[PDB]
Ligand binder design. Structure first.
Ligand SMILES: CC(=O)N[C@@H]1[C@@H](O)[C@H](O[C@@H]2O[C@H](CO[C@H]3O[C@H](CO)[C@@H](O)[C@H](O)[C@@H]3O[C@@H]3O[C@H](CO)[C@@H](O[C@@H]4O[C@H](CO)[C@H](O)[C@H](O)[C@H]4O)[C@H](O)[C@H]3NC(C)=O)[C@@H](O)[C@H](O[C@H]3O[C@H](CO)[C@@H](O)[C@H](O)[C@@H]3O[C@@H]3O[C@H](CO)[C@@H](O[C@@H]4O[C@H](CO)[C@H](O)[C@H](O)[C@H]4O)[C@H](O)[C@H]3NC(C)=O)[C@@H]2O)[C@@H](CO)O[C@@H]1O
Ligand SMILES: CC(=O)N[C@@H]1[C@@H](O)[C@H](O[C@@H]2O[C@H](CO[C@H]3O[C@H](CO)[C@@H](O)[C@H](O)[C@@H]3O[C@@H]3O[C@H](CO)[C@@H](O[C@@H]4O[C@H](CO)[C@H](O)[C@H](O)[C@H]4O)[C@H](O)[C@H]3NC(C)=O)[C@@H](O)[C@H](O[C@H]3O[C@H](CO)[C@@H](O)[C@H](O)[C@@H]3O[C@@H]3O[C@H](CO)[C@@H](O[C@@H]4O[C@H](CO)[C@H](O)[C@H](O)[C@H]4O)[C@H](O)[C@H]3NC(C)=O)[C@@H]2O)[C@@H](CO)O[C@H]1O
Lengths: 134, 134
């Protein structure tokens, strides 16, 4: 269905999760899901080039016990299809910080109040090239 | 056994898996398992500092339907407690090539004849700092 699925991550607050991968030449959208498990996501990171009505927009949302939360759309879109990008993610009690390329970075509330991230999955027109723990 | 567990890898012949991590100060052993799943491992890579009657010896083996194969032991042991070590693994239908530090490398047969690897697992006194797909 999608890409890489990693579990047992022991991502404690402060630590950084760096993910590098190449986006398809004709990418429609790609995603990175972080959380406790697939149904309890503290972060559903979804850049949309041309999908679900959104064009060149990063849509973020959470999932709690299977129920999707309120979406949060971002304006800056530093991803050119057919290139290699790197996203860096860290969190704390209050919220997570997503560092995108070109110096852009935004925050997303930690609606789940997760003290550790043990799950991550990738999907869409994206191919993981590296996963780093810092 | 077990720690970071990654599924849906879809690693194919020619592509190499690279893992970097730091070994524990009083590490008795650590392991990396590659296979089609938890019970069918084309490679159980296990560097033992002091475990199972072995002192500083790399024990490799396979597992088919849960049955451990015939152990193959290695001479070199470029591991030191506290230090960060990197290993790279490539494969084809014949055998996997474990490339260790300074140009040293050894081969282990692809006993199960897997064409692709979808499961990776890590365990023991090892801290994964990065996993790259090349
Ligand atoms: C003809 C003859 O006698 N030949 C002997 C061999 O018998 C002997 O074989 C090895 O023996 C060791 C030690 O076993 C001891 O404990 C037994 C009971 O627990 C006992 O019955 C044994 O006799 C032996 O006892 C020792 O006996 C000696 C002499 O009697 C005592 O010493 C004497 O003591 C005196 C004072 O009392 C005095 O000091 C004398 O000077 C002194 O000599 C000693 O004190 C006494 N100790 C004890 C506790 O009783 C075995 O460990 C070893 O077995 C392993 O290897 C063989 C194959 O070589 C396997 O068949 C066996 O299953 C073991 O394999 C390991 O299996 C595990 C489990 O699967 C593997 O780990 C897993 O691996 C997976 C990956 O594949 C995965 O990683 C997983 O996570 C792991 O858990 C290991 O990798 C396996 N390792 C290997 C290599 O296969 C031998 O049987 C030898 C050497 O001792 O000498 C002669 O050749
Ligand atoms: C300028 C611009 O870029 N604006 C965009 C908006 O376009 C965009 O809105 C989206 O619009 C979609 C299309 O609607 C049209 O098509 C249907 C189907 O035929 C029509 O029935 C409907 O009437 C619309 O028709 C259009 O009408 C206009 C006006 O008549 C036509 O234009 C006119 O045309 C004439 C000539 O005839 C002339 O040229 C005029 O000048 C011109 O104006 C136009 O041509 C015509 N189009 C067609 C084809 O006929 C909607 O489908 C889309 O819907 C989403 O948003 C609404 C609320 O806004 C929701 O109610 C709806 O359910 C849906 O929500 C999305 O739900 C999905 C899941 O179901 C969400 O995705 C999930 O998200 C999760 C994370 O939270 C996970 O990631 C999961 O995997 C993922 O699947 C998704 O996020 C939801 N989207 C939103 C926004 O919440 C939408 O409204 C908006 C919003 O994207 O952005 C603007 O920038």
């Amino acid at each position: 269905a999608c890409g890489l699925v990693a579990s047992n991550l022991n991502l404690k607050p402060g630590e950084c999760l760096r993910v590098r991968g190449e986006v398809a030449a004709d990418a429609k959208s790609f995603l990175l899901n972080l959380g406790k498990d697939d149904n309890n996501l503290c972060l559903h990171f979804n850049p949309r080039f041309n999908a679900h009505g959104d064009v060149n927009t990063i849509v973020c949302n959470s999932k709690d016990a299977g129920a999707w939360g309120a979406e949060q759309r971002e304006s800056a879109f530093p991803f050119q299809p057919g290139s290699v990008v790197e996203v860096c993610i860290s969190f704390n009690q209050t919220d997570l910080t997503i560092k995108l390329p070109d110096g852009y970075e935004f925050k997303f509330p930690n609606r789940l109040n997760l003290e550790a991230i043990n799950y991550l999955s990738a999907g869409g027109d994206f191919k993981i090239k590296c996963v780093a723990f810092e």
